[PDB]
Paper text:
Cytochrome b6f (cytb6f) catalyzes the rate limiting step of the photosynthetic linear electron transfer (LET) chain in plant, algal and cyanobacterial thylakoid membranes, connecting the light-driven reactions at photosystems I and II (PSI and PSII). The cytb6f complex uses the so-called Q-cycle to couple ET between the PSII electron acceptor plastoquinol (PQH2) and the PSI electron donor plastocyanin (Pc) (or cytochrome c6 in some cyanobacteria) to proton transfer across the membrane, conserving energy as a proton motive force for ATP synthesis. The Q-cycle involves the bifurcated transfer of electrons from the PQH2 donor bound at the oxidizing (Qp) site into so-called high-potential (2Fe-2S centre, bound by the Rieske iron-sulfur protein (ISP) subunit, and heme f, bound by the [name] subunit) and low-potential (hemes bp, bn and cn, all bound by the [name] subunit) cofactor chains. Here, we further our knowledge of cytb6f structure, function and regulation by determining cryogenic electron microscopy (cryo-EM) structures of the cytb6f complex from the extensively studied and easily transformable model cyanobacterium [name] with and without [name].
To reconstitute the cytb6f–[name] complex, we first over-produced recombinant [name] with an N-terminal His6-tag in E. coli and purified it by IMAC. His6-tagged [name] was re-bound to charged Ni2+ resin and purified StrepII-tagged cytb6f was applied to the column; a significant amount of cytb6f complex was retained on the column after washing, and subsequently co-eluted with [name]. In the structure of the complex with [name], additional density was observed on the cytoplasmic side of the complex sitting atop the ‘picket fence’ formed by the PetG, L, M and N subunits and the C-terminus of the [name] subunit. The structure of this extra protein is consistent with the solution NMR structure of [name] (RMSD 0.81 Å) and the position is in line with that predicted by crosslinking. Comparative superimposition of the two structures reveals displacement of the C-terminus of the PetG subunit, which moves away from subunit IV to accommodate [name]. The position of [name] binding to the complex and the close proximity of [name] to heme cn (the distance between the nearest edge of [name] and the edge of heme cn Fe is 15.9 Å) is noteworthy given that heme cn is postulated to act as the conduit for electrons from Fd–FNR in CET. Given the suggested role of heme cn as the conduit for electrons from Fd to the PQ pool during CET, and the phenotype of the Δ[name] mutant, which shows diminished LET relative to CET, we suggest that [name] competes with Fd–FNR for binding on the cytoplasmic surface of cytb6f. In the [name] cytb6f, the prenyl tail of the PQ molecule bound at Qn cannot straddle the intermonomer cavity due to the presence of two bulky tryptophan residues.
Author numbering:
A (entry chain B), B (entry chain J): 2 to 160
C (entry chain N), D (entry chain F): 1 to 34
E (entry chain V), F (entry chain X): 2 to 65
G (entry chain M), H (entry chain E), Q (entry chain O), R (entry chain G): 1 to 32
I (entry chain I), J (entry chain A): 1 to 222
K (entry chain D), L (entry chain L): 21 to 168, 172 to 192
M (entry chain K), N (entry chain C): 1 to 194, 201 to 285
O (entry chain P), P (entry chain H): 1 to 29
Amino acid sequence: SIIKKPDLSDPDLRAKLAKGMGHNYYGEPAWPNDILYMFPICILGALGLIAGLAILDPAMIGEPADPFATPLEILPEWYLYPTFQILRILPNKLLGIAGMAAIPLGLMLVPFIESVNKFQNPFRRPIAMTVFLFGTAAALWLGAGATFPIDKSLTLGLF
Amino acid sequence: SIIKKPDLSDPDLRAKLAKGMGHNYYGEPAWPNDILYMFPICILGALGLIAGLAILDPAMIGEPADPFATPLEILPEWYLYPTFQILRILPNKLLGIAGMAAIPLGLMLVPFIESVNKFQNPFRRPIAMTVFLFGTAAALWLGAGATFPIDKSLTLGLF
Amino acid sequence: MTAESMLANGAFIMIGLTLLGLAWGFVIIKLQGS
Amino acid sequence: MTAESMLANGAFIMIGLTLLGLAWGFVIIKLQGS
Amino acid sequence: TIEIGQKVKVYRLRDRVSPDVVGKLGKVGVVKDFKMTDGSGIGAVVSFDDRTATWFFEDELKAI
Amino acid sequence: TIEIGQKVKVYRLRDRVSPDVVGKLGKVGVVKDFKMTDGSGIGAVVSFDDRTATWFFEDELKAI
Amino acid sequence: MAAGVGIFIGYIAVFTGVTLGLLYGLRFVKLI
Amino acid sequence: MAAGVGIFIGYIAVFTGVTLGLLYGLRFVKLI
Amino acid sequence: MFSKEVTESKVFQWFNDRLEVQAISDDIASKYVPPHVNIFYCLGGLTLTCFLIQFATGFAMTFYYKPTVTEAFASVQYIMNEVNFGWLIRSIHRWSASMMVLMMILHVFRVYLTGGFKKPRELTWVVGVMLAVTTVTFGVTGYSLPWDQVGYWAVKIVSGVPAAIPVVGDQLVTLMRGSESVGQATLTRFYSLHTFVLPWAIAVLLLLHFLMIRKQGISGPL
Amino acid sequence: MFSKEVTESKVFQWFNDRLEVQAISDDIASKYVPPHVNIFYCLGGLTLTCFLIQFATGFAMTFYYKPTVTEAFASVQYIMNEVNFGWLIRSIHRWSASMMVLMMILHVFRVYLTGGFKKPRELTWVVGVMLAVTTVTFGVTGYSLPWDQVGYWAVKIVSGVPAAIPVVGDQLVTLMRGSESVGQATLTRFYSLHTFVLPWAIAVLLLLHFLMIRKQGISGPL
Amino acid sequence: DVPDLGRRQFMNLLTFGTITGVAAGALYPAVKYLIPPSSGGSGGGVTAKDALGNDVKVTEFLASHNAGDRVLAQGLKGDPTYIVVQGDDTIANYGINAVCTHLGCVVPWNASENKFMCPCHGSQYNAEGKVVRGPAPLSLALAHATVTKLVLSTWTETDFRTDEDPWWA
Amino acid sequence: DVPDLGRRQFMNLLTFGTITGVAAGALYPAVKYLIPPSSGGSGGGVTAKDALGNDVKVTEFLASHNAGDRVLAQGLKGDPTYIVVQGDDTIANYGINAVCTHLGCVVPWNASENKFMCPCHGSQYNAEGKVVRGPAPLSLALAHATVTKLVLSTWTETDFRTDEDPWWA
Amino acid sequence: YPFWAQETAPLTPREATGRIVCANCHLAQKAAEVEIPQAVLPDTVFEAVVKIPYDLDSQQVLGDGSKGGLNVGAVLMLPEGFKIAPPDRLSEGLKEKVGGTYFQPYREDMENVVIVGPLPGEQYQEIVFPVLSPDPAKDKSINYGKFAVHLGANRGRGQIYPTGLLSNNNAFKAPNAGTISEVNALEAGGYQLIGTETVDIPAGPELIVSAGQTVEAGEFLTNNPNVGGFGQKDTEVVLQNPTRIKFLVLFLAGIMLSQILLVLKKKQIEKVQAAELNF
Amino acid sequence: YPFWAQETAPLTPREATGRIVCANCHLAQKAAEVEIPQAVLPDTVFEAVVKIPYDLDSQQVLGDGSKGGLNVGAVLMLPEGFKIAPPDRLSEGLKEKVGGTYFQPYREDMENVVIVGPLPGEQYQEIVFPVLSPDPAKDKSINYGKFAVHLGANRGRGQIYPTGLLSNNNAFKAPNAGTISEVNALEAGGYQLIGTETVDIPAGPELIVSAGQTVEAGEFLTNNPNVGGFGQKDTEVVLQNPTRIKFLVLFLAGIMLSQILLVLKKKQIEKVQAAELNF
Amino acid sequence: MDILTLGWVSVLVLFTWSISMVVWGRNGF
Amino acid sequence: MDILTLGWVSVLVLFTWSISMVVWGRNGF
Amino acid sequence: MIEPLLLGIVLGLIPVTLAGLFVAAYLQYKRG
Amino acid sequence: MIEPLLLGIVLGLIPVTLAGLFVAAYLQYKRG
Ligand code: FES
Ligand code: FES
């Protein structure tokens, strides 16, 4: 597509770019290039892939809930695998709860702490990519530990 | 209160007023005069009057539904009293459903039929006020008829 | 008194108290006189 | 294959077919005439 | 569209009015203010010689 | 602070750069285009004598 | 009910008294 | 899953053939 | 819309710097209520007040009401009796349904007798009539939820009238009832409509309606 | 946004005389996608796609699912077996919950690794985190609706966690469970939260989020 | 040759027509889903059930009514169908579907007058269920009532009252 | 004089303070409403039921399960409480609440080991219910059991295991 | 009478359809009214004036045959917990108003439902039922709320006995299409009319078919002498908690005062705005 | 053995908790696996390779206190409708692969659940269970969907008989605190340890407390000779309707083609826009 | 004073008063 | 040809193809 | 069932609102 | 319970998307 160039002569676009906004004023046209044509490409991709995953791997009717019999290994959804492990590994329950609540509240502070550095590129914020890659590896490690026995949860049975 | 005067020198306001719009450009200020202060007077009026009607005349727990016994007099809500009377009195069920559906579509046609005339005042809309007052009296008469027995529904037992 | 009578009396009280509403607001407007 | 086997191979299929999609769409870009 | 402070003559009366207002018909009155009218047109209040200021539709009055 | 065609001279390099840009430090160039850099900055492509054009941040370059 | 009209009158009267007490009072202390 | 790999090759070859056929054909009839 | 103290406060300057919230203030403050507007133009807004009460108290009654044929009447008498202030919440909900429909009828009388619907505002009136239909649908679906005698038989009557059409009507009856006969499927479907489908339909219609009244403003003087 | 043909047609000319729909077209067409945007900026939009499927198929499952402890599992196996394509609708819904959360994690990775959250888009990120919490709440409330073993015990565990708070934990557990023990009150409350409260909360948070994206636009080039 | 209106509209017909075919493919399972499953039962002999959930035994009924009055029991299409005794010994071979045709108010049986008398709007029916008077256009549907378990089957033969093909069939 | 900022803010405090008092008056019934009603005034003598929900008779329980076996019966706070027999003649006067203290996982009984063994994280308890091992800091709650109707009363007296105040109380 | 309702349907006078059993035998349908307060505080004697209004001069065929005065009975089905106030709770004014009317429960353990009658209609055109509202505080089963009060008030004789025969106060109809060959009085008002199926009618209604005209099955042989009729009137009574209204009055006074303060804050902002416009 | 599970818990091997009855007596825990296809078309013989891996050189103590080879059994709980394919339905590859393994239903009317064992572990480290998927089309009760396939797989001798006694393959422990006295070989290899409570142990275990150290209640007296254990693996098998995948493949090809046409319409509008900018 | 009368008169008075406060604030009808 | 294999390969091909159509349409990644 | 109070509020408000909208209309229509 | 296919897709996409975002970032960062 023929791409508009940012009209930097315009003082309004220069002021908006100073504040960090105004990037929706140059490049290829939003409509119909991307919104009309590409968005339904992704919508139909996702609808078709979700329908194919539903058909090929349908949902399982479990057994009826027994309040008297606890399943040997109860697990939550996969997205709460790292959170669930936090609960079981930590000896004090209240500490586990504090960690669970520190996940979303800790996320909510990411922008305020990180905005000290104006650069958006990961390679220009080394410390933020170190903390992020450590936290993503720790959340994937906790999630993988959730799916093991509590004895071998912290090592994934590797050690 | 300070009342803005319509700045008719402005050609934009004159163009808007030509199309029938642009009446939100003159008069008393919307905020905070009316929206902030006067609207909560009505919100608290209605909340207090609905709470007082609820307390003084609480909801009535009816009888448990019996599929085998039809109430001697089954009635809908009051707003469907004219809709319901139409059903019972009109012999053919299909004309009854035609009338029930003709209420909303005829209402949807009110603007297109009546916009031939530009004058909004009821006193400058003789035929429209005739049809409206006749239809309001007919809907109140049908609604009052719904409560009565089917023998005395069309006359309200009056004659 | 009875619930049934609140069909008739309740309707007239409404007509009565809407206008008495209206009128009294004008009374306040006149009384304030500023 | 088995349902349980689809954890590891399915993850490698995901990485592989995401990169193959990128590659094949760059291929389609080139195969068209500018 | 209509000049303020402009003498106007009422050629026609759109609505049925009291006899006094009908007396105003055909009388020159300097418009004193603009009132928004029913059709969203700019009607003009007309101050006549006797000072019975009565509003009129723009259609009714004719600029003089 | 920068305009197109304006002769410029890179004096600092905010980020780590390849050997070419190492050599380009203290080099004479002519602005070729306006880059859109991170931090919402107005960068500038610079065509040096070498004939290879490299984008630079606004702070890096010195107008001369 | 006649008792209801008496209580209604009293209600309205007292509320007018408070509204105008507050109106003229705040106008006097210049809050309005 | 050798047969599955065969089907995958077949799907990408069929569809890429349809895509380039349609693109060059439409450009030839001057539609695109 | 924002007083000087709020305009100068560093917090508001933070919001203004990022989302330019001052533009909202300018848009809200630019509007004016014309002189011809009177108390009756409140009726539309009061129709929304009664809806928002109905939105809140309905949310209250979803926590306790059980849309089952064996438990719906028991759960409604539980709301009334056992639940704290459930008598108040349910009675307020019934009363705000009746008062929403009454305020709506009065609002249609105002609009009609002020020529609000006239060109250019034909579509505001049409979305109005759609809103009205949606509200009566809320009333009908709600009337049957207690699964009391009145509710069950009102749904019996109303849901069987589509049968009047010789062929298609039978399908419409099986769709409305969700079964050949009013039963548990009819209560699950009427509850899904009442508490989910119809709040979203009336919220999309309320947004359309209020957007068209915001754009066009209020009607002219009578 | 309107071609030359749609524009100048008497119908578009009608809608544009009244509502000035052309301004919407001008606003949609004024925007541009900067060059730095790539395939990964799709991920947030796909998070909405997965939500809209979850909105539609959830609407589908409200017509048949019965939120009662005696009938919830029977109604879920009725959806699966008896209902037409209810296997497909339920499987699509279960799969789109996982894919919504996955698309949301991949979108948090994009945003965070593109510096999208940095000033001035701090509040968009914060509403993002709110959205994420709401989505995981949708997942938890939904997981328990079938009232199967895994569901009932997952709600047992998660809903008894607030007990560990020293002073106010027990009342939070009684509140979220709606009873001393996970039972019918917990299923009525989790269903009310799932199908009514949480769709409205996530729709208000989605509208806030998208309004802040639109006002501020997309982040700068990396 | 820049694509003109005609060619642009043809490419819009191609693209959005194919997306409309895919959309209809995705919508069809949803529409069929919303249509209730056709699982009313066999559609023929549906054992008449008691007012309570239990399915009424023919003999137990034959030992309960005592011939005082007509009784109702869940019928075809889930409408309470009267079961006549007509001698106490053996229930009548026919059961009058007790759903008024005007709107569906279940018609009670006034054994004093020997005629159904709906209180809803006052549509009378005789012992056989034909409309002697009233708004109801059609007659009450009939069902088969075997003495065996009870099975209710729509009246497939001509009704013996109006001597016409049954509207309900 | 024109109201200054202080005067304007004081009148704003008057008006919106009163509207906040009315709002709190209207909001209090809603918040109290959302708070679930207490099942009963006192959670005492809570007749032991079953998962199916039928009341469990002491005598019927005694006849079954022979001796030295544990079977769960719904107890106080709607938690399954094991009911010991300890001789097949009179149920023990105490019933261990088989709910893991740290989590909610119901604890099964292994009669072979003579020790509770929770499968979730392996939190064991002895025959008496006391914490012997595992991540659960607190012990299983106790109740009274009556051999004559079965009722479970909150065990308030000092537990005879740790000889300290009941944590559950 | 009302006690044949106890006999015929001892469980409850009202059916599930809401039709009081009185109608099963009192075929005619006259009016009926109850003047029950829209709301009644707990543990308070109130009155429910059941009007059973029939024309005073109208005369009905007494069982013997000779016309006479009508009587009036009723089944006032009060809500759960309500009863008939005991005489000690009655005030002297209500001691006088009620008089010596005997009120009996439809059955023991069902004191709410009360069956008055039969009472001479001349002086019981209005039967004051002295009710005593229950206290939800004392009785947990009772709660405050709107509850339905169903009345079945009947005047005049019935038409069908509990035996299932037909009373003299009833328009007889043809058993079979048989010509009236014979009509004889035998110093009585009964008429052995004559397929020529011999049928007998008692000494109640006068014949409309006295002539030798042929008869068809179903056609009324006699006029309908029933000048009375059963009626039923379902109303509602709100058992109101006084505390609910105390807190309601407090809440609505708070709202009224807040509305005053809203108009006064608007007056203040209008003064500020007027000073802003001035330059 | 597997039949002691049939006897002990005839209704079902799996408890409500999902713990197969095996564990109640096979106390140890070793790994167990099932190689079941992720999906199986209806009415198709497939294979479920139940892996029961134990170290083959490992030797257990036998009933007669003599080291020897382990055996391997299992309880493959297939979904409803599934069964063991009869020999006719088996293919030659599966006819030979399965061999002469005898598979029996856990109980009549429970063909889905199948018990194998005891089998010599030397040659049965993997037991191929030839399953036959059901046809929902032919069987109304059965439907297409994802179903759970539980497994039990003991690989060694138990520890407690159905009688409730304890087997010689067990770590015997102290009943009461005492001190060993007069220790001797009571049986051929059994011992008689001596509160001085006389306790007897079988020949299997070897004493870890043979020294004259004092004993305390509940202290393991011998080594644990249990080299085997029981394991359970719950998996899933999707009984897939082939028509579902035919229409899925057709729908996804439709989507793919529509995506091509969307890119082509974007190309057309890019051409129109590029020529529109040019003047 | 009957508390039932006082409740009905409080609701009636709040309806009258809300109408009067709306015509007072807005300065007309 | 195994229908099951064609079922999984259709979904895998639609994932690959949607990625390739998004990078083709947008003319890059 | 019939709710008499609610129909009293309805039949009271409907005609008073109609009368008041016709009065506001007449007064706007009047020419001073 | 563990859905192995879903976990496979999660563990496949997470790291490929992370690598792709770090590659996009490196390509924007590097100077031509
Ligand atoms: S439904 Fe019975 S007469 Fe109309
Ligand atoms: S809850 Fe018992 S071991 Fe985890």
